Design an enzyme around this catalytic site. Structure first.
Site, PDB file in Angstrom:
ATOM      1  N   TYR A   7       8.120   5.316   1.715  1.00  0.00           N
ATOM      2  CA  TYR A   7       6.723   5.170   1.902  1.00  0.00           C
ATOM      3  C   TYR A   7       6.012   4.927   0.508  1.00  0.00           C
ATOM      4  O   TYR A   7       6.589   5.780  -0.415  1.00  0.00           O
ATOM      5  CB  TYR A   7       5.881   5.795   3.048  1.00  0.00           C
ATOM      6  CG  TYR A   7       4.798   5.422   3.323  1.00  0.00           C
ATOM      7  CD1 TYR A   7       4.797   3.920   4.102  1.00  0.00           C
ATOM      8  CD2 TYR A   7       3.473   6.170   3.297  1.00  0.00           C
ATOM      9  CE1 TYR A   7       3.483   3.340   4.554  1.00  0.00           C
ATOM     10  CE2 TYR A   7       2.335   5.372   3.899  1.00  0.00           C
ATOM     11  CZ  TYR A   7       2.486   4.286   4.415  1.00  0.00           C
ATOM     12  OH  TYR A   7       1.208   3.493   4.899  1.00  0.00           O
ATOM     13  N   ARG A  13       0.973   5.316   7.342  1.00  0.00           N
ATOM     14  CA  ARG A  13       1.909   4.963   8.278  1.00  0.00           C
ATOM     15  C   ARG A  13       3.290   5.923   8.417  1.00  0.00           C
ATOM     16  O   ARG A  13       4.122   5.985   9.330  1.00  0.00           O
ATOM     17  CB  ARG A  13       2.294   3.630   8.539  1.00  0.00           C
ATOM     18  CG  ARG A  13       0.977   2.567   8.737  1.00  0.00           C
ATOM     19  CD  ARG A  13       1.408   1.428   9.158  1.00  0.00           C
ATOM     20  NE  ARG A  13       0.353   0.772   9.721  1.00  0.00           N
ATOM     21  CZ  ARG A  13      -0.059   0.938  11.110  1.00  0.00           C
ATOM     22  NH1 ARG A  13       0.885   1.317  12.049  1.00  0.00           N
ATOM     23  NH2 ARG A  13      -1.252   0.336  11.362  1.00  0.00           N
ATOM     24  N   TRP A 103      -6.582  -3.326   5.214  1.00  0.00           N
ATOM     25  CA  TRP A 103      -6.399  -2.469   4.097  1.00  0.00           C
ATOM     26  C   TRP A 103      -5.954  -3.159   2.772  1.00  0.00           C
ATOM     27  O   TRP A 103      -6.438  -2.480   1.678  1.00  0.00           O
ATOM     28  CB  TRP A 103      -5.250  -1.328   4.381  1.00  0.00           C
ATOM     29  CG  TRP A 103      -5.340  -0.646   5.701  1.00  0.00           C
ATOM     30  CD1 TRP A 103      -4.802  -0.990   7.091  1.00  0.00           C
ATOM     31  CD2 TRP A 103      -6.154   0.382   6.274  1.00  0.00           C
ATOM     32  NE1 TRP A 103      -5.126  -0.103   7.896  1.00  0.00           N
ATOM     33  CE2 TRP A 103      -5.813   0.644   7.507  1.00  0.00           C
ATOM     34  CE3 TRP A 103      -7.210   1.272   5.374  1.00  0.00           C
ATOM     35  CZ2 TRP A 103      -6.554   2.075   8.103  1.00  0.00           C
ATOM     36  CZ3 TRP A 103      -7.601   2.381   6.041  1.00  0.00           C
ATOM     37  CH2 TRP A 103      -7.567   2.667   7.215  1.00  0.00           C
TER      38      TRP A 103
HETATM   39  N1  GSH Z   1       3.447  -1.722  12.364  1.00  0.00           N
HETATM   40  C1  GSH Z   1       4.197  -1.311  11.266  1.00  0.00           C
HETATM   41  C2  GSH Z   1       3.294  -1.786   9.909  1.00  0.00           C
HETATM   42  C3  GSH Z   1       3.972  -1.753   8.522  1.00  0.00           C
HETATM   43  C4  GSH Z   1       3.366  -2.099   7.601  1.00  0.00           C
HETATM   44  O1  GSH Z   1       2.591  -3.171   7.410  1.00  0.00           O
HETATM   45  N2  GSH Z   1       3.259  -1.517   6.426  1.00  0.00           N
HETATM   46  C5  GSH Z   1       2.481  -1.867   5.017  1.00  0.00           C
HETATM   47  C6  GSH Z   1       2.125  -0.669   4.327  1.00  0.00           C
HETATM   48  S1  GSH Z   1       1.293   0.274   5.213  1.00  0.00           S
HETATM   49  C7  GSH Z   1       3.425  -2.701   4.339  1.00  0.00           C
HETATM   50  O2  GSH Z   1       4.650  -2.575   4.046  1.00  0.00           O
HETATM   51  N3  GSH Z   1       2.891  -4.007   3.891  1.00  0.00           N
HETATM   52  C8  GSH Z   1       3.531  -5.052   3.347  1.00  0.00           C
HETATM   53  C9  GSH Z   1       3.168  -5.230   1.753  1.00  0.00           C
HETATM   54  O3  GSH Z   1       2.391  -4.318   1.291  1.00  0.00           O
HETATM   55  O4  GSH Z   1       3.834  -5.726   1.319  1.00  0.00           O
HETATM   56  C10 GSH Z   1       4.730   0.366  11.039  1.00  0.00           C
HETATM   57  O5  GSH Z   1       3.770   0.989  11.642  1.00  0.00           O
HETATM   58  O6  GSH Z   1       5.805   0.686  10.307  1.00  0.00           O
END
Ligand code: GSH
Ligand code: GSH
Ligand code: MG
Ligand code: MG
Lengths: 198, 198
Positions: A7, A13, A103
């Site tokens: 992460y 998350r 975000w």
């Molecule tokens: N519902 C998913 C959401 C995953 C998600 O959208 N994570 C974001 C970071 S918080 C991400 O990877 N975004 C795509 C990017 O930034 O390229 C979970 O809880 O794992």
């Protein structure tokens, strides 16, 4: 087994997974990606999103799917299938709300407008319903902690960063945070985790 | 036991529950409410949202929590805990994307622009990731159907209403939805269900 969590350097998350590993006393690698390295990492993941959890080389995705996996056959999941449903449902109600926040929105005027509407106008309804559901129970489900209680601590911690007076009407929801944070494994994790805004 | 599903007269967020009841041959009351009757019903529901499912005197909420409840201990869930995680994760990936659409937006120009952006710019990334994950497997998980496959048929049915040509270049995703629709219990339900846009 051998667990590697990937992460950003944030609670975000991944934090639900981190709470569960702490509570279950499971060792894992807490890999934190710097923002500038994300374009390199993103194409290596199945759905291009984080968190992911590698389990003996198998990459799992979706934070709540992973949290649910880690709690299978434990009291944290809910002790009956109906209670598991109630736990899952509180979690998705919280996650639905948190997922509304833009975000990554580049336009800061639109971002702030949406954040303000969510925090000022929409949040009171969520909080009222969570408080009514909790009632005078010790924990969301009844008399034992579940990962829904963990997720409330996590979500509320971030909402409080955004709006410090968020919980000013709901002392039972504050007491619930306090109860989660007083669990010894959770207390120890909160003391040692990296101090990040989000 | 007196399963009563409450939702609008739409496929929408109730449809996954309706597929599962059909597949498992579980009798239920499919209670559809007109928009006019919603304001009186809303405050009687613990979280103020639909669908809900009445089960043994309880009112369960959250469509995917309920779906997961109904599939517990069935092959539809995934046979192992790792497979259950993978099923759960594909479902949340789909639901995350469908939840980006501003279904309730009343500024129709804004709604159309957002829908068009999602379908034009964002959908190819989701669809590539889904197609890649499915690969040449028989079903998402491998050699047997799960409720993730059902959820693909459901989500894609609405996506195709919004953009009829959307799956033109994803023959594996077309084949998966055709395979789901050919399961006799699902075929029967598709032939029976109210014809609605969404
Ligand atoms: N519902 C998913 C959401 C995953 C998600 O959208 N994570 C974001 C970071 S918080 C991400 O990877 N975004 C795509 C990017 O930034 O390229 C979970 O809880 O794992
Ligand atoms: N993630 C939830 C979403 C539930 C939801 O937002 N439902 C909408 C209708 S599709 C609703 O009840 N909206 C509030 C309202 O219309 O008053 C689920 O899948 O059950
Ligand atoms: Mg969700
Ligand atoms: Mg094939």
């Amino acid at each position: 087994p051998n667990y590697k969590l990937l992460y950003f350097n944030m609670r975000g998350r991944a934090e639900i997974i981190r709470y569960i590993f702490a509570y279950l006393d499971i060792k894992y690698e807490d890999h934190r990606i710097e923002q500038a390295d994300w374009p390199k990492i993103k194409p290596t993941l199945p759905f291009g999103k984080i968190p992911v959890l590698e389990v003996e080389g198998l990459t799992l995705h979706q934070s709540l799917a992973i949290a649910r996996y880690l709690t299978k056959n434990t009291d944290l999941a809910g002790k009956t299938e109906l209670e598991q449903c109630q736990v899952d449902a509180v979690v998705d109600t919280l996650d639905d709300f948190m997922s509304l926040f833009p975000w990554a929105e580049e336009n800061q005027d639109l971002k702030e407008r949406t954040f303000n509407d969510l925090l000022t106008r929409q949040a009171p309804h969520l909080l009222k319903d969570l408080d009514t559901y909790l009632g005078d129970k010790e924990w969301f489900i009844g008399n034992y902690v579940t990962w829904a209680d963990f997720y409330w601590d996590i979500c509320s911690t971030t909402l409080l960063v955004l709006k410090p007076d968020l919980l000013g009407i709901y002392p039972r929801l504050v007491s619930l945070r306090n109860k989660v944070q007083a669990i010894p494994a959770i207390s120890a994790w909160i003391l040692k985790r990296p101090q990040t805004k989000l």
